[PDB]
Ligand binder design. Structure first.
Ligand SMILES: CCCCCCCCCCCCCC(=O)SCCNC(=O)CCNC(=O)[C@H](O)C(C)(C)COP(=O)(O)OP(=O)(O)OC[C@H]1O[C@@H](n2cnc3c(N)ncnc32)[C@H](O)[C@@H]1OP(=O)(O)O
Ligand SMILES: [Cl-]
Lengths: 393, 7
């Protein structure tokens, strides 16, 4: 029974998470540092799976194996709390998220049925340098934990977690960062998703949103109408020549937050260079030819579970948005217009970084889902959403 | 990560 608020979570016990190097939910933390020492001998044997299941590292460069992972996630990954929509990460998106600079094949950790070889579980790690308050640490980011619906509630997820932990330890890394919609010991920060309608007619039709407080449909479409072209002078897609200045802009901008990525220039290229239907980045190049701002959002459609025939909910997720000369409000207004132009139905953003300064003004509505941020084997004070400067996939 | 929709 996963908890979604900390009031529900503070009641229950965590048989697995109590055994792990994370702070207790009750804890107020005032120190900064590891919970347990770096290990100088690591278990060489994989952890034991239930009878009939085996480990398999997934080579995603094999298109057949990538399709197997795509299918596992398409049928069993995260749903909304009403079981009406399920994320539909594309194979090309999965390659973007799972093969960044430094990726390792043993960190694409699958579980297969022994007799049929069917893929029924997965978890992944990717390397990341993380800045947390006054410390920079090489960590991994853990994502795409998924157990087949037919295999749920058999304690397979703790085995997946211990096994990726072991495989990361073997590479000399003893901290991780991750996000989840559920409350576990112990969030370092809690963010909330907000939603900006772009195609309100379709969102109402699929019951992603509802005609609120009796306005007509006519009145709703006019309320959410956007200009057909952006307003900021010099806005254009990011190009190869912009990689260094985007890296420079992002690095200085992120210093004001307390949990942030520390990206090399090669990582900036990976995470921001535009790729159709995966990642969009637009820069502002001013009258002097200098790039002074940039906006970015990634593509994440969702299956409509009750009518899986009726196309899909096309959503854009705000990524990193850096402003030094264009007002952030204007930059995000342009982000909405570009997402509308590109055929997105909704534009999603969290309330982290400086996002609360524009959410209400740009007619975002508050969502029903939280996003909790976590660190593994790092005990530090929690922080408000506006100090979180990290966006995962 | 988390699938949210408008309240
Ligand atoms: C140094 C390196 C360290 C690296 C590791 C760092 C930590 C990484 C941590 C993972 C980061 C993930 C980041 C993402 O990818 S968050 C996305 C998670 N994926 C989904 O929500 C997809 C849909 N759901 C599923 O596929 C299953 O329901 C999952 C796989 C989630 C659980 O399978 P199942 O439903 O069959 O449960 P069980 O009986 O096997 O096991 C129940 C135990 O599992 C605890 N549980 C439930 N949900 C989560 C969760 N989302 N994170 C951590 N723990 C979770 C639960 O509280 C209980 O522990 P405790 O209550 O007894 O204590
Ligand atoms: Cl705290």
């Amino acid at each position: 029974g996963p908890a979604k608020t900390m009031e529900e979570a503070s009641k229950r016990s965590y048989q697995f998470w109590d055994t792990q190097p994370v702070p207790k939910l009750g804890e107020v933390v005032n120190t900064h540092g590891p919970v347990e020492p770096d290990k100088d001998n690591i278990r060489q044997e994989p952890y034991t799976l239930p009878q009939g299941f085996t480990w398999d590292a997934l080579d995603l460069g094999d298109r057949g194996v990538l399709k197997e992972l795509y299918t596992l996630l398409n049928e069993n990954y995260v749903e909304d709390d009403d079981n009406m929509f399920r994320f539909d990460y594309s194979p090309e998106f999965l390659l973007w998220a799972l093969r960044p600079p430094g990726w390792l094949p043993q960190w694409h950790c699958g579980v297969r049925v022994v007799s049929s070889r069917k893929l029924v579980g997965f978890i992944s790690a990717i390397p990341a340098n993380i800045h947390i308050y006054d410390t920079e640490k090489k960590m991994v980011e853990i994502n795409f934990l998924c157990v087949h619906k037919k295999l749920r509630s058999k304690r397979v997820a703790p085995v997946l977690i211990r096994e990726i932990t072991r495989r990361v330890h073997l590479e000399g890394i003893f901290q991780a960062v991750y996000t989840a919609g559920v409350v576990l010991p112990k969030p370092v920060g809690t963010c909330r998703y907000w939603h900006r309608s772009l195609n309100p007619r379709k969102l109402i039709e699929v019951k992603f949103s509802h005609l609120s407080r009796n306005m007509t449909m006519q009145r709703t479409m006019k309320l959410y109408r956007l200009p057909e072209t952006p307003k900021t002078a010099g806005l254009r897609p990011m190009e190869t020549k912009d990689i260094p200045v985007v890296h420079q802009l992002l690095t200085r901008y992120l210093k004001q937050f307390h949990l942030t990525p520390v990206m090399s220039q090669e990582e900036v290229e990976h995470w921001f260079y535009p790729q159709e239907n995966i990642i969009d980045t637009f820069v502002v190049e001013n009258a002097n030819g200098e790039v002074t701002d940039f906006l970015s959002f990634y593509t994440l459609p969702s299956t409509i579970m009750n009518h899986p025939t009726h196309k899909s909910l096309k959503a854009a997720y705000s990524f990193y948005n850096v402003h030094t000369q264009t007002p952030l409000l204007d930059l995000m207004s342009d982000a909405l217009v570009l997402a509308k132009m590109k055929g997105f139905d909704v534009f999603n953003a969290l309330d982290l970084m400086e996002n609360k300064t524009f959410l209400e003004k740009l007619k975002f509505g508050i969502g029903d889902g939280n996003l909790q941020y976590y660190l593994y084997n790092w005990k530090c004070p929690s922080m408000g959403a506006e100090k979180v400067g990290l966006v995962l996939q | 990560x988390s699938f949210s929709k408008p309240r």
